[PDB]
């Protein structure tokens with residue numbers, strides 16, 4: 094079929110591609126982050142959220158890709174080819190999973206609407222030539238639990 | 249981490265292993281069944297259900313694993329060497345995704361608890377030797393006052 | 397001693413021998429069924445039932461002969477003597493444990509009384525010559541006193 | 543699976559390992575003790591108790607292991623392989639069943655709680671060096687109304 | 693026995709590994725910090741806190757570990773013993789010594805909040821990462 | 831710094847040296863005892879007691895010491911240097927940890943002043959020449975809280 098993994102999350106593959114290749118953390122940094130922030134939730138018998146379900150598959154899937162590419166490597170006769178298949182995976186699909194794991198980790202950390210707002214805010218910022226570009230990049234942070242109008246009300 | 253893809257859906261990796269490798273359809277037949285029964289829902293911009301979400305990633309991820317395994321196969325030069333790869337795929341990640349594709353498709357079709365009690369029913373049926381096993385495999389699927 | 401492992405469960409070794417040796421599943425298929433169907437019960441600190449006690453040590457006891465089986469392949473300089481051992485484990489005591497593992501798994505799955513009536517019904521059915529015998533084999537489908 | 547045979551009886555494999563190997567009686571002395579003390583119960587067609595169920599399996603399963611070790615004695619031509627297995631059966635597996643047979647026989651004779659407190663008591667006692675260790679080894683052992691006198 | 697030194701203090705070995713190995717100061721700078729900030733408490737006959745008790749053992753244990761490495765490194769090329777401590781026990785103790793010293797200095801909740809804040813910050817590539825790193829208050 | 835690991839527990843290094851070096855069990859036998867008596871407490875997320883905290887760190891530190899000693903002893907050629915690495919552990923760090931492990935394990939089992947009263951009682955006992963020394967060593971058992979006469983008086 095033509096399945097977009099971001100469509101059920103109010104985004105698209107093309108929208109995620111608006112962020113430059115060098116913006117996303119490495120795969121290991123994303124995997125280490127998901128474990129640090131969400132290991133209890135990711136291993137729990139609760140759905141928790143659609144982001145948890147997607148992130149659970151993506152972590153396992155990338156593991157399967159690395160498991161298969163590494164096993165094929167240990168069979169190649171040339172030791173200089175030991176990591177050749179792993180390198181092909183990282184160049185052919187490495188960015189795809191870096192987008193996917195970053196999208197779900199950040200959406201759980203900052204909120205989906207906040208993440209999508211930051212996406213277009215940073216994509217315009219990074220494409221501004223540096224002479225006109227302000228030094229402070231757009232900040233990605235969670236919105237406050239209660240609004241200012243609410244706090245002044247209960248005063 | 250130690251993430252069981254089936255734990256959030258009320259099953260385990262070990263429970264799905266109870267079904268033999270030759271029970272599951274081919275991955276090509278499994279993908280065509282997900283398209284036939286659920287193409288519009290799987291492509292919709294809606295969560296629909298956690299099965300839909302998981303099934304969406306599995307279909308895409310298998311495409312990643314298939315073109316990698318195919319690339320390794322068509323770039324090899326030895327029928328022995330590429331039978332090694334096919335036998336590794338069929339035993340490990342190929343079997344893993346035939347299980348996960350079957351679990352979610354069937355859960356969307358027959359129901360999760362119907363699927364699970366079928367799982368244990370067929371698993372002991374197929375392990376009964378043929379001379380004692382019934383030839384029929386298990387299937388996957390008022391008062392008088394009421395009329396007055 | 398003279399302990400019969402089935403006496404406390406309402407059967408005897410001779411009654412279990414009424415079933416032909418090829419009726420029982422393989423040990424691999426029996427151990428996988430005990431796991432898929434009763435993993436959490438067999439591992440819990442609960443007695444559950446006398447079947448669970450017998451099953452627990454039956455699994456561990458077979459695991460002892462099958463860990464003796466991987467042992468005759470890492471410590472034996474004679475791959476012949478390696479094969480003479482694993483052949484005895486699987487075809488001599490193997491039939492014995494297939495009977496024992498099948499008995500307790502089936503009793504927890506279908507009921508001890510149901511299993512015993514099936515045992516007699518199938519044993520007579522398998523011994524009926526096939527001309528007179530119906531082609532379909534008979535179908536197999538909490539508190540304990542001291 | 544990951545089954546601990548003592549878990550359902552309020553103990554663990556690691557706890558039984560706290561007793562040194564030379565503490566347990568021999569298998570022969572264990573079988574003779576279960577026979578002298580519980581032959582009729584173990585042979586009866588009653589469940590009796592979970593300790594009886596477990597002890598019945600252990601006695602028979604050890605019988606299978608000894609039958610194999612005697613069979614392997616006449617049927618294995620290579621002596622280096624034959625005596626490697628008969629030693630592996632009566633030493634590595636022997637210690638395994640010496641704990642099992644001792645645990646269930648002792649629990650029937652002295653009670654599960656008395657057995658568990660003794661196990662811990664002897665483990666720290668036998669690990670105390672003999673110069674500081676008391677010579678008495680810890681012991682494993684086990685109504686009238688007022689109207690009668692007035 | 694599978695004991696996690698951080699478990700009784702509300703953390704895990706896995707959570708501490710989220711901080712990169714180049715974030716922690718050296719054991720020497722960490723021991724010098726514990727001396728400047730807590731010598732009187734650490735040498736006193738009072739428990740003070742479980743953090744003090746754990747920190748007391750860790751300081752002494754590093755002494756035991758370095759004396760053993762010193763004796764091997766001398767009484768016997770042995771640049772592997774220095775590369776062993778630097779890459780194995782050194783990182784294990786830099787994490788442990790930092791955890792307890794920072795908890796006494798800033799608070800367990802504040803240290804844990806900073807831990808996940810810096811771990812995500814340092815993993816953001818510098819192009820998108822803000823210039824001001826998260827701080828430990830002091 | 832100059833930390834005495836027994837100071838916060840009402841003892842000193844000098845006081846623990848009063849016990850002969852052959853009075854203590856091996857480190858293995860002491861660790862075997864700690865697991866058999868306190869595996870649940872030592873692995874629990876609760877502080878329990880300062881003794882639990884100290885015993886916690888001592889167990890892990892011995893693993894660090896033995897792993898470093900193993901790696902050193904593994905990559906040595908001459909077996910005499912192998913035996914020299916094991917002999918260093920035996921005479922130096924082993925005695926210190928046999929004292930520290932025994933002190934905390936006993937304190938959790940019998941109480942601080944019971945093991946301290948026993949320490950001085952055995953240290954004087956074993957230093958008595960065997961001719962005047964009673965044949966049976968003093969027993970390590972917790973002091974009965976009160977006498978039986980006072981127990982019946984307050985019944």
Ligand SMILES: Cc1ccccc1NC(=O)c1cccc(C(=O)Nc2ccc(F)cc2)c1F
Pocket residue numbers: 118122123124126127195198199231232233234809810812813815816820821822825826
């Ligand atoms: C963390 C922090 C603390 C304190 C102050 C700022 C930040 N961070 C940021 O302002 C930030 C800006 C752009 C992108 C990211 C990101 O995408 N990081 C990221 C996402 C997922 C992941 F797994 C690893 C790193 C930022 F964090």
Ligand SMILES: Cc1ccccc1NC(=O)c1cccc(C(=O)Nc2ccc(F)cc2)c1F
Pocket residue numbers: 273277278279281282350353354386387388389
């Ligand atoms: C369909 C039908 C019509 C009419 C009558 C019966 C059936 N079917 C079944 O009783 C059935 C029994 C066992 C396993 C399966 C399965 O696993 N199929 C399957 C699952 C996923 C998939 F993608 C493709 C095929 C059955 F369908």
Ligand SMILES: Cc1ccccc1NC(=O)c1cccc(C(=O)Nc2ccc(F)cc2)c1F
Pocket residue numbers: 369370372373375376380381382384385386421425426427429430498501502534535536537
């Ligand atoms: C399962 C089923 C579903 C549906 C319909 C029938 C069956 N089964 C049977 O009619 C059956 C008949 C004889 C013996 C056995 C058995 O003893 N199997 C067995 C027991 C334990 C074990 F570990 C493995 C296999 C049967 F299941």
Ligand SMILES: Cc1ccccc1NC(=O)c1cccc(C(=O)Nc2ccc(F)cc2)c1F
Pocket residue numbers: 567571572573575576644647648680681682683
């Ligand atoms: C009997 C007695 C009479 C009189 C006084 C004492 C005893 N006994 C004991 O104080 C005793 C102490 C340690 C271990 C055992 C044991 O484990 N024995 C054992 C267990 C199982 C078995 F099959 C054979 C012997 C003790 F009996």
Ligand SMILES: Cc1ccccc1NC(=O)c1cccc(C(=O)Nc2ccc(F)cc2)c1F
Pocket residue numbers: 663664666667668669670674675676678679680855859860861863864932935936968969970971
């Ligand atoms: C146990 C017993 C049972 C029964 C009767 C006596 C004892 N024991 C003692 O009267 C005893 C006397 C001095 C020192 C020790 C010790 O220090 N042991 C020790 C401490 C820690 C450890 F991990 C291992 C052994 C004693 F046990």
Ligand SMILES: Cc1ccccc1NC(=O)c1cccc(C(=O)Nc2ccc(F)cc2)c1F
Pocket residue numbers: 717721722723725726790793794826827828829830
């Ligand atoms: C001190 C200060 C004064 C003034 C302004 C800022 C700071 N500090 C920090 O913003 C800080 C940020 C990250 C990590 C550390 C740390 O972990 N340091 C550390 C911890 C233990 C130790 F032993 C030695 C150094 C920071 F201090």
